[PDB]
Design a protein around this ligand. Structure first.
Ligand SMILES: O=C(O)CCC(=O)C(=O)O
Ligand SMILES: [Cl-]
Ligand SMILES: [Mn+2]
Ligand SMILES: [Mn+2]
Ligand SMILES: [Zn+2]
Ligand SMILES: [Zn+2]
Length: 454
């Protein structure tokens, strides 16, 4: 009783051949891994990217964490890496009255779930989480500073997490819009019991996480197909987390015992990620976890061709929930269309198919608003507007293909789903603002078809 650990997620040990191309590998394991939501990847024994940094010159300000199950937390003192490490080690050491490596991982796990469910315990810990900036950079080698041959071997690795976003098979690469929180790696400096709440990635993207060094990171993961089951379980136990939020910076998340999910028949898997190992999370796979002790991880989001239809589904889901978008998915698609001649041919083929759905949906939406009595129209370069100047008044979606405006409310827009929500003026006063005519769009899709050689 007390805590029954979830079954282990899949662990892959790819050969050097398999390991050579990360996207090929990820596509290969997908049938297995997408059934468990997370998986662990052990690189070949000699793939050993060198880590080097000065523990005295790296500063950061950590977040304070209270450890209470089902208590709301928002998704997003000064330490050096050395002084944080000293604090971390002493904390774990004093907690168990043992040397830190003698503490069994199964005991830290059992104790984590005891302490978050116990009202009387008020343990607080600290956790570093921040973007790769000049003040705090990637743990992988980056070009600049004269680099050693060893570092140069790893500069262009696909598994070097600085590269993987721009690998011409990450559709996020071609996005020119500002999506910094989603394109640059994040760094995580952990201590014993520091934790990450249950969540899925923005736009239901993949994530991939590398533990550079230190004590393990414990994970729990749920497959994408069970995302709404989990949400329903959580909505019942903690409805406060499901209230509408004023922006992206107000997402509410929480710690929740995997055994609670398992009791409600939600499939849950676990793993201990050790130093030198990767964890990969799949689209819409809920995950949470905690650190076993002082450690240092680096993670980044990415999007494959397999993801494109899910990305479209996600934005639709965001619309129904009135949730803010990080970028416009249609804008991403058209940007790639506009670059069809330089796209990978399998990418071009997959983009072409998403675009065909986009165009057919847009056609139907425009016919519907025309029948509502919107007649006047004018082309508009949506991509030049800051995001906050092109969100639907009603559902907060980032507009790109089209929107409705009225001179009555200067600057406001609704998407074509919410024509009735703009104002009280009759529709003949409205304008359809559109990025492309349907006649502009079909040749763009054609360029993709030619590139894909279809
Ligand atoms: O390691 C953490 O604290 C966050 C991990 C995570 O959510 C990811 O890498 O997708
Ligand atoms: Cl507690
Ligand atoms: Mn994550
Ligand atoms: Mn509605
Ligand atoms: Zn809308
Ligand atoms: Zn009006």
């Amino acid at each position: 009783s007390m805590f029954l650990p979830p079954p282990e997620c899949p662990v892959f040990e790819p050969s050097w051949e398999e390991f050579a191309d990360p996207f090929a590998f990820i596509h290969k394991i997908r049938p297995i891994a997408e059934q468990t939501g997370i998986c662990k990847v052990r690189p070949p024994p000699d793939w050993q990217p060198p880590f080097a940094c000065d523990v005295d010159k790296l500063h950061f300000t950590p977040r304070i964490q209270r450890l209470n199950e089902l208590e709301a937390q928002t998704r997003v003192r000064d330490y050096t890496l050395r002084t944080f490490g000293e604090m971390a080690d002493a904390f774990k050491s004093d907690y168990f009255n043992m040397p830190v490596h003698m503490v069994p991982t199964e005991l830290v796990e059992k104790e984590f779930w005891r302490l978050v469910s116990t009202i009387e315990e008020d343990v607080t810990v600290e956790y570093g989480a921040d973007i790769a900036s000049k003040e705090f950079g990637s743990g992988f080698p980056v070009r600049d500073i004269k680099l050693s041959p060893e570092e140069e071997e790893y500069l262009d690795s696909g598994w070097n997490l600085n590269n993987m976003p721009v690998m011409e098979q990450s559709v996020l690469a071609h996005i020119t819009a500002d999506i910094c929180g989603m394109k640059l790696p994040w760094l995580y400096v952990g201590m014993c019991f520091s934790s990450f709440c249950w969540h899925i990635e923005d736009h239901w993207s993949y994530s991939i996480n590398y533990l550079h060094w230190g004590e393990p990171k414990t994970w729990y993961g749920v497959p994408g197909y069970a995302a709404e089951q989990l949400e329903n379980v959580m909505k019942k136990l903690a409805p406060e987390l499901f209230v509408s939020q004023p922006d992206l910076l107000h997402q509410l998340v929480t710690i929740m015992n995997p055994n609670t999910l398992m009791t409600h028949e939600v499939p849950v898997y676990r793993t201990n990620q050790c130093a030198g190992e990767f964890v990969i999370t799949f689209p819409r796979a809920y995950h949470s976890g905690f650190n076993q002790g002082f450690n240092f991880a680096e993670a980044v989001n990415f999007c494959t061709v397999d993801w494109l239809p899910l990305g479209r589904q996600c934005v639709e889901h965001y619309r129904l929930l009135h949730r803010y978008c990080v970028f416009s998915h249609d804008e991403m698609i058209c940007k790639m269309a506009s670059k069809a001649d330089v796209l990978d041919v399998v990418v071009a083929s997959t983009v072409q198919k998403d675009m065909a759905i986009m165009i057919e949906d847009e056609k139907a939406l425009r016919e519907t608003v025309r029948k509502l009595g919107v007649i006047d129209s004018e082309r508009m370069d949506f991509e030049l507007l800051p995001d906050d100047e092109r969100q639907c008044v009603k559902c907060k979606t980032t507009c790109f293909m089209s929107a409705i405006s009225c001179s009555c409310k200067p600057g406001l827009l609704v998407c074509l789903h919410h024509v009735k929500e703009l104002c009280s003026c009759p529709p003949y006063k409205y304008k359809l603002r559109y990025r492309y005519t349907l006649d502009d769009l079909y040749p763009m899709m054609n360029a993709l078809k030619l590139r894909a050689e279809s």
